[PDB]
Structures are given as structure tokens and as C-alpha cells.
Amino acid sequence: ADDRCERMCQRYHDRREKKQCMKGCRYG
Numbered sequence: 001a002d003d004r005c006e007r008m009c010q011r012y013h014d015r016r017e018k019k020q021c022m023k024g025c026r027y028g
Contacts, residue, residue: 005021005022005024005025006018006021009021009025
């Protein structure tokens, strides 16, 4: 899919903080 959540999660950047984001985007 497109980097939708990633774009909005750009605030994190670091793959580390991105973890929590990927987990939250697993809802839909």
C-alpha cells in the first residue's frame, strides 16, 4: 500500500519510534 501512515508518522522518522506507529496503523 501507499505510505499513508508513514507520511503522517514522519514526526518519528527513527525506525524505533516508528514501531509504535506501525502497531497503531494495524487497526485500519
